[PDB]
Amino acid sequence: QGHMKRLEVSNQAKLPTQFGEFYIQCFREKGSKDHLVVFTPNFSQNPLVRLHSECLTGDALGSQKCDCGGALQMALERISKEGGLVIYLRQEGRGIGLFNKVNAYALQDKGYDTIQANEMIGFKDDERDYSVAGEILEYYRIKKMRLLTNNPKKIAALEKYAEVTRESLIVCA
Amino acid sequence: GHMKRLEVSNQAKLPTQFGEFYIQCFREKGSNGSKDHLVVFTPNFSQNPLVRLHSECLTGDALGSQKCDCGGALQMALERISKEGGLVIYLRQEGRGIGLFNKVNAYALQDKGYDTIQANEMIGFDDERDYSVAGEILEYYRIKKMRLLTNNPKKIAALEKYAEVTRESLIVC
């Protein structure tokens, strides 16, 4: 589907998974990051949408940490039963990346407290931008949606691209 | 703290559905955040440890894909190192070093029934994966002998340069 302001869209492809049959489609922001949307063949005019920030440990390694453990899996189970999309953004560790997140873990392991840890690695504010997700929503022509999130910054960002109903994602509560 | 090509994080504990691992991030110095390689390992592994040199594959690794290209491979390797002792060296080299965007387009061509010669040409496909950073990781952990869980002669051939390698076959499908 071509390009829209340094965002390239791949063809869609079938992906059979243990959760069921999805389509996937890559959105390459050129800079340069390959985001992915995973969607059920049919979804409604008010689909369940999960905006997921990459978390390698929870997503791929079966982490049991509450930071992101089980979250991707829960979202894929939910869109599978109910229809919808997962918008998989490549923004590991709130935008500061895996390296720093691993050091944050190791600081936690040694028993530093939250503020000491942040201070030592350097993480000031959450550096994530979600406007790229807005473009993906326009591409699929989603006007209203149920967003699976407990993050008001994600809610706040997407409400200028569509009508958002919040829905909580409690994996670890 | 640096090495030759890589910067190394602190080691961090990761509790997983497979057992308790340690993880350590190896970042290519002067990389944007897209070369944060990760080693996942069991505490105090042997002198002939099981090693999986894993090329990032989002669909298999994170999305529960049932495709034989990479479906189940990461899970199998984590189950195995947890029982036997060892390491997964997770290299950020999605799509044979060509990337996720191209991989999804390659999938879409297979969906349409193009044959393998046709798909390659149309995608613009050489296997661009370098494994020499895995060598520095092996040197860092002082691994001079290993059982390499793979069916790829190029992975074997490359790691033979740094250590004595015994091949172990990976059977997922």
Short mmCIF file of C-alpha atoms in Angstrom, two decimals:
data_model
loop_
_atom_site.label_atom_id
_atom_site.label_comp_id
_atom_site.label_asym_id
_atom_site.label_seq_id
_atom_site.Cartn_x
_atom_site.Cartn_y
_atom_site.Cartn_z
CA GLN A 1 0.00 0.00 0.00
CA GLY A 2 2.88 2.40 -0.68
CA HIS A 3 4.08 5.24 1.57
CA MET A 4 2.67 8.11 3.68
CA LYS A 5 5.27 10.65 4.97
CA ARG A 6 8.23 8.27 5.66
CA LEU A 7 5.95 5.40 6.66
CA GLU A 8 6.06 2.40 4.29
CA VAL A 9 3.35 -0.28 4.29
CA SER A 10 4.05 -3.88 3.32
CA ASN A 11 1.69 -6.35 1.83
CA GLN A 12 -0.49 -8.26 4.21
CA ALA A 13 0.36 -11.89 4.94
CA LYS A 14 -1.32 -14.88 6.54
CA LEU A 15 0.05 -15.99 9.87
CA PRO A 16 -1.27 -19.19 11.45
CA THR A 17 -0.55 -19.06 15.19
CA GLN A 18 -1.39 -21.09 18.31
CA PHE A 19 -3.97 -18.37 19.07
CA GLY A 20 -5.63 -18.82 15.66
CA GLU A 21 -5.30 -17.48 12.11
CA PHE A 22 -4.21 -13.83 11.74
CA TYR A 23 -2.96 -11.48 9.08
CA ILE A 24 0.16 -9.44 9.62
CA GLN A 25 1.41 -6.29 7.97
CA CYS A 26 4.59 -4.32 8.51
CA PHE A 27 4.86 -0.54 8.81
CA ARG A 28 8.44 0.62 8.36
CA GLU A 29 9.00 4.08 9.80
CA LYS A 30 12.00 5.51 7.94
CA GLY A 31 14.00 5.62 11.38
CA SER A 32 14.42 2.77 10.75
CA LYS A 33 11.91 0.60 12.69
CA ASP A 34 9.70 -2.24 11.50
CA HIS A 35 6.44 -2.07 13.44
CA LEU A 36 3.89 -4.83 12.89
CA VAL A 37 0.13 -5.05 13.01
CA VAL A 38 -1.49 -8.37 13.76
CA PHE A 39 -5.19 -8.49 12.88
CA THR A 40 -8.06 -10.94 12.58
CA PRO A 41 -9.43 -11.29 9.02
CA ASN A 42 -12.64 -9.50 9.98
CA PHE A 43 -12.93 -6.93 12.65
CA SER A 44 -15.84 -4.61 13.28
CA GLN A 45 -16.39 -0.83 13.03
CA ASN A 46 -15.52 -0.62 16.74
CA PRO A 47 -12.69 -3.17 17.05
CA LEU A 48 -10.68 -4.20 20.09
CA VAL A 49 -7.26 -2.58 19.61
CA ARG A 50 -4.13 -3.29 21.65
CA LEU A 51 -1.26 -0.85 21.25
CA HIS A 52 1.73 -2.90 22.38
CA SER A 53 5.26 -1.58 23.03
CA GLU A 54 7.88 -4.21 22.27
CA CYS A 55 9.06 -6.03 25.38
CA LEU A 56 11.39 -8.84 24.40
CA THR A 57 11.46 -10.45 27.86
CA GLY A 58 7.67 -10.70 28.27
CA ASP A 59 6.92 -11.12 24.56
CA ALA A 60 9.45 -13.78 23.58
CA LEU A 61 11.17 -15.19 26.67
CA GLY A 62 8.13 -16.09 28.80
CA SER A 63 9.05 -13.61 31.54
CA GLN A 64 6.88 -13.77 34.66
CA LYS A 65 7.70 -10.19 35.65
CA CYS A 66 4.65 -7.97 35.93
CA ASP A 67 6.23 -5.18 33.87
CA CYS A 68 5.13 -6.87 30.61
CA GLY A 69 4.88 -10.63 31.29
CA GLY A 70 1.87 -12.35 29.72
CA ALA A 71 0.61 -9.06 28.20
CA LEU A 72 1.21 -9.74 24.51
CA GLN A 73 -0.14 -13.27 24.92
CA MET A 74 -3.28 -11.97 26.68
CA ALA A 75 -3.88 -9.42 23.94
CA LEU A 76 -3.53 -12.03 21.16
CA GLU A 77 -5.96 -14.37 22.96
CA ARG A 78 -8.46 -11.51 23.30
CA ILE A 79 -8.41 -10.22 19.70
CA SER A 80 -8.58 -13.84 18.58
CA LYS A 81 -11.81 -14.57 20.52
CA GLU A 82 -13.34 -11.14 19.84
CA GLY A 83 -11.77 -9.84 16.59
CA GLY A 84 -9.39 -6.84 16.44
CA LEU A 85 -5.77 -5.72 16.06
CA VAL A 86 -2.48 -5.65 17.93
CA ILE A 87 -0.30 -2.71 16.95
CA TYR A 88 3.21 -3.82 17.81
CA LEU A 89 5.49 -0.83 18.19
CA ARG A 90 9.26 -1.15 18.31
CA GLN A 91 9.85 1.04 21.35
CA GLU A 92 11.55 -1.30 23.86
CA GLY A 93 11.94 0.07 27.41
CA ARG A 94 9.73 3.16 27.05
CA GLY A 95 11.96 4.32 24.19
CA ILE A 96 15.33 3.95 25.99
CA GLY A 97 15.91 0.41 24.71
CA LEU A 98 16.71 -3.08 25.94
CA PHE A 99 20.26 -2.37 27.11
CA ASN A 100 19.12 0.17 29.71
CA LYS A 101 16.13 -1.92 30.69
CA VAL A 102 18.45 -4.86 31.46
CA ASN A 103 20.59 -2.61 33.65
CA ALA A 104 17.42 -1.35 35.36
CA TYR A 105 16.55 -4.97 36.13
CA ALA A 106 20.02 -5.65 37.59
CA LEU A 107 19.78 -2.58 39.77
CA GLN A 108 16.39 -3.83 41.04
CA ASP A 109 17.94 -7.28 41.67
CA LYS A 110 20.60 -5.69 43.93
CA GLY A 111 17.85 -3.91 45.88
CA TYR A 112 18.21 -0.28 44.86
CA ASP A 113 14.86 1.50 45.05
CA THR A 114 12.89 2.91 42.09
CA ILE A 115 14.27 6.45 42.19
CA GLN A 116 17.89 5.36 42.68
CA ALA A 117 17.60 3.03 39.70
CA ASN A 118 16.15 5.67 37.36
CA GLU A 119 18.75 8.17 38.48
CA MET A 120 21.58 5.72 37.80
CA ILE A 121 20.48 4.65 34.29
CA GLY A 122 19.23 8.13 33.29
CA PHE A 123 15.54 7.57 32.45
CA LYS A 124 13.82 10.94 32.88
CA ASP A 125 10.41 10.87 31.16
CA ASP A 126 8.64 8.14 29.19
CA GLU A 127 10.12 8.81 25.71
CA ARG A 128 7.39 6.99 23.66
CA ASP A 129 5.61 8.63 20.74
CA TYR A 130 2.38 7.03 19.54
CA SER A 131 1.53 9.20 16.51
CA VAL A 132 2.79 6.46 14.19
CA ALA A 133 -0.03 4.30 15.65
CA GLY A 134 -2.50 7.02 14.61
CA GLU A 135 -1.35 6.67 11.01
CA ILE A 136 -1.89 2.90 11.20
CA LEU A 137 -5.43 3.49 12.47
CA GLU A 138 -6.16 5.78 9.48
CA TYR A 139 -4.68 3.23 7.08
CA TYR A 140 -7.15 0.59 8.35
CA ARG A 141 -9.88 3.31 8.44
CA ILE A 142 -10.70 2.74 12.09
CA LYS A 143 -12.84 5.62 13.38
CA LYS A 144 -13.86 4.29 16.79
CA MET A 145 -12.14 1.58 18.82
CA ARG A 146 -11.88 -0.12 22.19
CA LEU A 147 -8.30 0.35 23.38
CA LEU A 148 -6.92 -2.30 25.74
CA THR A 149 -4.67 -0.19 27.95
CA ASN A 150 -4.16 1.28 31.44
CA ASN A 151 -2.07 4.17 30.09
CA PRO A 152 -3.72 7.60 29.72
CA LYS A 153 -0.89 8.83 27.43
CA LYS A 154 -1.87 6.13 24.86
CA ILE A 155 -5.56 7.04 25.33
CA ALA A 156 -4.75 10.75 24.98
CA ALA A 157 -2.73 10.20 21.79
CA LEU A 158 -5.25 8.07 19.89
CA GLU A 159 -8.39 10.07 20.68
CA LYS A 160 -7.33 12.67 18.06
CA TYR A 161 -7.22 9.89 15.44
CA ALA A 162 -10.40 8.07 16.50
CA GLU A 163 -13.08 7.70 19.20
CA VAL A 164 -11.56 5.70 22.06
CA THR A 165 -13.34 3.59 24.68
CA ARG A 166 -10.84 2.46 27.31
CA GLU A 167 -10.61 -1.16 28.43
CA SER A 168 -8.26 -2.37 31.16
CA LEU A 169 -5.57 -4.98 30.54
CA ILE A 170 -5.03 -6.76 33.87
CA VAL A 171 -2.53 -9.62 33.42
CA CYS A 172 -0.83 -9.23 36.75
CA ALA A 173 -3.01 -7.36 39.28
CA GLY B 1 31.82 -1.56 29.80
CA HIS B 2 33.07 -2.24 26.28
CA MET B 3 34.80 -5.10 24.44
CA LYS B 4 35.80 -5.00 20.77
CA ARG B 5 32.50 -4.34 18.96
CA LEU B 6 30.13 -4.67 21.91
CA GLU B 7 29.05 -2.93 25.07
CA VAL B 8 27.89 -5.30 27.87
CA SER B 9 25.10 -4.70 30.38
CA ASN B 10 24.99 -5.92 33.93
CA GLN B 11 23.52 -9.41 34.37
CA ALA B 12 19.89 -9.56 35.49
CA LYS B 13 17.65 -12.35 36.77
CA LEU B 14 14.67 -13.29 34.64
CA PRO B 15 12.01 -15.58 36.09
CA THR B 16 10.24 -17.37 33.23
CA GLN B 17 7.69 -20.08 32.64
CA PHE B 18 10.73 -22.23 31.67
CA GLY B 19 12.66 -21.58 34.86
CA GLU B 20 14.96 -18.91 36.23
CA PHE B 21 17.49 -17.49 33.79
CA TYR B 22 20.02 -14.70 33.83
CA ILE B 23 20.09 -12.22 30.95
CA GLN B 24 22.75 -9.87 29.65
CA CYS B 25 22.47 -7.34 26.80
CA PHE B 26 25.28 -6.95 24.28
CA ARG B 27 24.88 -3.69 22.34
CA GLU B 28 26.88 -2.94 19.20
CA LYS B 29 28.81 0.22 20.04
CA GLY B 30 27.51 3.17 18.04
CA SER B 31 24.24 1.42 17.14
CA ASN B 32 20.89 3.25 17.28
CA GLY B 33 19.15 0.75 19.64
CA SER B 34 18.45 -1.85 16.93
CA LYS B 35 21.52 -3.94 17.84
CA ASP B 36 20.76 -4.74 21.46
CA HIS B 37 21.58 -8.46 21.34
CA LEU B 38 20.59 -10.52 24.38
CA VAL B 39 22.09 -13.57 25.96
CA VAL B 40 19.79 -15.77 28.04
CA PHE B 41 21.62 -18.27 30.22
CA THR B 42 21.34 -20.71 33.13
CA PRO B 43 23.42 -20.13 36.29
CA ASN B 44 26.86 -21.83 36.19
CA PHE B 45 26.55 -23.83 32.93
CA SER B 46 29.08 -26.57 32.02
CA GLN B 47 32.26 -26.79 29.88
CA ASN B 48 30.31 -28.32 26.97
CA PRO B 49 27.09 -26.23 27.26
CA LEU B 50 24.15 -26.26 24.91
CA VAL B 51 24.18 -23.00 22.88
CA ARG B 52 21.38 -21.76 20.64
CA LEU B 53 22.48 -19.02 18.26
CA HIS B 54 19.08 -17.52 17.56
CA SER B 55 18.30 -15.04 14.79
CA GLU B 56 15.46 -12.79 15.85
CA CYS B 57 12.15 -13.88 14.34
CA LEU B 58 9.27 -11.82 15.72
CA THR B 59 6.49 -14.02 14.32
CA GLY B 60 7.91 -17.27 15.76
CA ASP B 61 9.44 -15.80 18.85
CA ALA B 62 6.64 -13.57 20.05
CA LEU B 63 3.45 -14.20 18.06
CA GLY B 64 2.98 -17.97 18.42
CA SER B 65 3.50 -18.62 14.72
CA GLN B 66 3.05 -22.22 13.58
CA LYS B 67 5.15 -21.69 10.44
CA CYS B 68 8.18 -23.91 10.22
CA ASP B 69 10.57 -21.07 9.24
CA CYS B 70 11.03 -20.26 12.97
CA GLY B 71 7.82 -21.33 14.79
CA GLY B 72 8.60 -23.04 18.10
CA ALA B 73 12.38 -22.63 17.75
CA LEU B 74 12.93 -20.11 20.55
CA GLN B 75 10.57 -21.95 22.90
CA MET B 76 12.31 -25.28 22.25
CA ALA B 77 15.75 -23.76 22.86
CA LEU B 78 14.66 -22.15 26.17
CA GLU B 79 13.03 -25.41 27.36
CA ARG B 80 16.20 -27.29 26.48
CA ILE B 81 18.77 -24.98 28.09
CA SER B 82 16.62 -24.85 31.23
CA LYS B 83 16.81 -28.67 31.56
CA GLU B 84 20.40 -29.19 30.34
CA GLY B 85 22.18 -25.93 31.13
CA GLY B 86 23.36 -23.39 28.55
CA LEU B 87 22.78 -20.18 26.63
CA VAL B 88 20.61 -18.60 23.99
CA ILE B 89 22.47 -15.91 22.04
CA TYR B 90 19.64 -13.78 20.61
CA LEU B 91 20.96 -11.72 17.66
CA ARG B 92 18.93 -8.84 16.22
CA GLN B 93 19.14 -9.92 12.57
CA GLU B 94 15.52 -10.37 11.56
CA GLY B 95 14.83 -11.69 8.02
CA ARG B 96 18.33 -13.01 7.26
CA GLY B 97 19.74 -9.53 7.94
CA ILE B 98 17.21 -8.12 5.43
CA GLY B 99 14.55 -7.21 8.00
CA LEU B 100 10.93 -7.76 8.99
CA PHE B 101 9.43 -5.61 6.20
CA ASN B 102 10.94 -7.82 3.52
CA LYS B 103 10.12 -10.99 5.41
CA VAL B 104 6.43 -10.05 5.53
CA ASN B 105 6.50 -9.26 1.81
CA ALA B 106 8.17 -12.64 1.20
CA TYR B 107 5.33 -14.30 3.17
CA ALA B 108 2.70 -12.46 1.07
CA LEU B 109 4.30 -13.85 -2.14
CA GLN B 110 4.14 -17.40 -0.73
CA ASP B 111 0.46 -16.78 0.09
CA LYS B 112 -0.13 -15.97 -3.61
CA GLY B 113 1.64 -19.15 -4.78
CA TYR B 114 4.80 -17.75 -6.34
CA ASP B 115 7.57 -20.36 -6.27
CA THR B 116 10.81 -19.92 -4.35
CA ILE B 117 12.93 -18.64 -7.27
CA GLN B 118 10.20 -16.09 -8.11
CA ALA B 119 9.74 -14.85 -4.55
CA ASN B 120 13.51 -14.26 -4.03
CA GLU B 121 13.86 -12.31 -7.26
CA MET B 122 10.81 -10.18 -6.57
CA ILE B 123 11.96 -9.39 -3.00
CA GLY B 124 15.48 -8.56 -4.26
CA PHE B 125 17.28 -11.45 -2.58
CA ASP B 126 22.16 -13.12 -0.38
CA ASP B 127 21.85 -14.24 3.26
CA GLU B 128 23.28 -11.07 4.88
CA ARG B 129 23.72 -12.45 8.43
CA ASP B 130 27.02 -11.99 10.19
CA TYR B 131 27.74 -14.11 13.24
CA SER B 132 31.09 -12.68 14.35
CA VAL B 133 29.49 -10.77 17.28
CA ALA B 134 28.44 -14.20 18.61
CA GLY B 135 32.15 -14.97 18.65
CA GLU B 136 32.88 -12.05 20.96
CA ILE B 137 30.05 -13.19 23.22
CA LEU B 138 31.55 -16.72 23.32
CA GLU B 139 34.95 -15.19 24.20
CA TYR B 140 33.32 -13.06 26.97
CA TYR B 141 31.83 -16.14 28.66
CA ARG B 142 35.10 -18.02 27.98
CA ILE B 143 33.29 -20.79 26.11
CA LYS B 144 35.89 -22.80 24.19
CA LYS B 145 33.66 -25.82 23.51
CA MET B 146 29.92 -26.17 22.94
CA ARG B 147 26.96 -28.02 21.53
CA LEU B 148 25.45 -25.71 18.89
CA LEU B 149 21.73 -26.23 18.47
CA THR B 150 21.31 -25.65 14.72
CA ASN B 151 20.84 -26.98 11.18
CA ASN B 152 22.69 -24.05 9.55
CA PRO B 153 26.25 -24.89 8.30
CA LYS B 154 27.08 -21.16 8.18
CA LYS B 155 26.39 -20.74 11.94
CA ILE B 156 28.48 -23.85 12.62
CA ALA B 157 31.25 -22.80 10.25
CA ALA B 158 31.36 -19.29 11.78
CA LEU B 159 31.48 -20.40 15.42
CA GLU B 160 34.15 -23.06 14.68
CA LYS B 161 36.52 -20.08 14.36
CA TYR B 162 36.08 -19.23 18.08
CA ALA B 163 35.42 -22.61 19.74
CA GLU B 164 35.25 -26.35 19.21
CA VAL B 165 31.69 -27.00 18.06
CA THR B 166 29.50 -30.09 18.09
CA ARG B 167 26.31 -29.81 16.10
CA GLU B 168 23.00 -30.71 17.68
CA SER B 169 19.97 -30.82 15.38
CA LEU B 170 16.92 -28.60 15.92
CA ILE B 171 13.70 -30.48 15.13
CA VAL B 172 10.53 -28.39 15.48
CA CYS B 173 8.45 -29.62 12.51
#
